Amino acid sequence: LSNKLTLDKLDVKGKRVVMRVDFNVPMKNNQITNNQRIKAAVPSIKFCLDNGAKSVVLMSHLGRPDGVPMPDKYSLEPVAVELKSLLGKDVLFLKDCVGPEVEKACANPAAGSVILLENLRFHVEEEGKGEPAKIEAFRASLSKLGDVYVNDAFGTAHRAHSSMVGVNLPQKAGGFLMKKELNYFAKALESPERPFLAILGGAKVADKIQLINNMLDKVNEMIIGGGMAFTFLKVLNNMEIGTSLFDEEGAKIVKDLMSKAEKNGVKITLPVDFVTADKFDENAKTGQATVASGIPAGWMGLDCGPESSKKYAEAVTRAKQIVWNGPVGVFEWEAFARGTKALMDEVVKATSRGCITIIGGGDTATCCAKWNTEDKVSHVSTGGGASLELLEGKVLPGVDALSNI
Ligand SMILES: Nc1ncnc2c1ncn2[C@@H]1O[C@H](COP(=O)(O)OP(=O)(O)O)[C@@H](O)[C@H]1O
Ligand SMILES: [Cl-]
Ligand SMILES: [Mg+2]
Numbered sequence: 031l032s033n034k035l036t037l038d039k040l041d042v043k044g045k046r047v048v049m050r051v052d053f054n055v056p057m058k059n060n061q062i063t064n065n066q067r068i069k070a071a072v073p074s075i076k077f078c079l080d081n082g083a084k085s086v087v088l089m090s091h092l093g094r095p096d097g098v099p100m101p102d103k104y105s106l107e108p109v110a111v112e113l114k115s116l117l118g119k120d121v122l123f124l125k126d127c128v129g130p131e132v133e134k135a136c137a138n139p140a141a142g143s144v145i146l147l148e149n150l151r152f153h154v155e156e157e158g159k160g161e162p163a164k165i166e167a168f169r170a171s172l173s174k175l176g177d178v179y180v181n182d183a184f185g186t187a188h189r190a191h192s193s194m195v196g197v198n199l200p201q202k203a204g205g206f207l208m209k210k211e212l213n214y215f216a217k218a219l220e221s222p223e224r225p226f227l228a229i230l231g232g233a234k235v236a237d238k239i240q241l242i243n244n245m246l247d248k249v250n251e252m253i254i255g256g257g258m259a260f261t262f263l264k265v266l267n268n269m270e271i272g273t274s275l276f277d278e279e280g281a282k283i284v285k286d287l288m289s290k291a292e293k294n295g296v297k298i299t300l301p302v303d304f305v306t307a308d309k310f311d312e313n314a315k316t317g318q319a320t321v322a323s324g325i326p327a328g329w330m331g332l333d334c335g336p337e338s339s340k341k342y343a344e345a346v347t348r349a350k351q352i353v354w355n356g357p358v359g360v361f362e363w364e365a366f367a368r369g370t371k372a373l374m375d376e377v378v379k380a381t382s383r384g385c386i387t388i389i390g391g392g393d394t395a396t397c398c399a400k401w402n403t404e405d406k407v408s409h410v411s412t413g414g415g416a417s418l419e420l421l422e423g424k425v426l427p428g429v430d431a432l433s434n435i
Pocket of ligand 3: 393
């Protein structure tokens with residue numbers, strides 16, 4: 031961020047600060063299961079308050095409510111509560127993020143006020159889909175809530191969304207988490223140790239299958255696991271995949287991706303076996319399948335099996351650097367957690383013999399919390415897809431929109 035305004039050089043004395051953060055935290059049974067992303071923004075928030083900010087107004091999304099208000103399902107109210115304990119200051123929660131009531135609450139706050147707005151994605155204008163005039167009005171409203179803007183939302187920095195690129199204030203500064211994460215990746219990606227392995231799992235298949243093409247110019251090996259794998263296996267192996275995650279658009283480029291991996295000498299490791307489930311539920315009935323057997327109709331693959339874990343281990347053993355985004359099964363539910371635990375064991379072992387190991391994402395970092403490995407890998411990032419877009423070699427939109435020096 032040498033060329034961008036950052037918080038260390040932003041005068042906040044007597045100023046209202048409006049701050050985009052990534053508070054898209056994981057939830058199970060309605061409880062926050064990892065406060066990593068909240069804790070990670072505390073240094074920027076505290077700095078603002080300690081250097082005389084009149085207020086700090088925090089804004090984020092939670093999940094993918096697709097431009098409809100879903101307070102019953104995706105409210106940020108629980109985050110406000112958690113932020114209090116981590117900050118040592120109280121926080122006022124507002125039930126919207128724009129409009130006359132929100133504008134009034136933020137216009138002239140008591141000295142030192144911390145305010146958290148409701149989920150930005152309850153409005154279609156944040157993503158811009160789910161209207162140019164209402165997008166402008168949404169952005170205008172957000173801009174009234176502070177005098178200066180800070181973006182500390184590293185985990186969302188790949189998204190060219192209204193709160194991330196559309197705030198119109200004279201000073202738009204990168205926060206300290208933004209700086210910490212970008213600095214770590216800049217050093218780690220400049221001259222990676224080789225072989226350099228990417229591990230791509232998870233459930234955001236439509237988005238992340240589109241990142242593979244450019245990642246194939248940067249890495250020497252790739253594990254394609256979790257929900258990502260089934261689109262590949264259906265196309266390449268004619269495998270029956272049941273109700274497993276499948277991306278129609280990505281299927282159309284699978285053969286081209288494999289051709290490119292061959293051209294570039296990138297070894298691709300796909301799974302060969304699975305733990306199956308009869309529905310998407312923690313207490314589903316379960317089974318086993320191989321690529322050869324296929325997955326029965328009406329069943330979904332929610333973990334890899336033991337022969338897949340062996341092949342993943344072989345790739346980890348060859349690696350001198352690893353970037354991992356996306357668990358290799360539904361690790362939140364014990365029936366489907368074994369493959370991700372086994373891979374974590376291998377990645378921790380690799381670190382101990384000198385591998386540079388980077389795990390990132392809202393959910394994947396929660397694997398580190400669950401199995402107590404946060405200090406047993408080289409770097410745990412608050413960015414998942416944001417970190418993969420860095421690996422591709424891009425300038426992230428939320429960084430690009432910051433004020434130039
Ligand atoms: N085979 C699978 N089917 C469905 N979901 C899966 C599968 N494997 C992993 N997942 C899910 O992937 C999710 C995380 O993916 P994603 O959100 O892309 O990762 P991150 O949050 O680290 O960026 C987890 O909640 C996990 O349950
Ligand atoms: Cl997606
Ligand atoms: Mg996630």
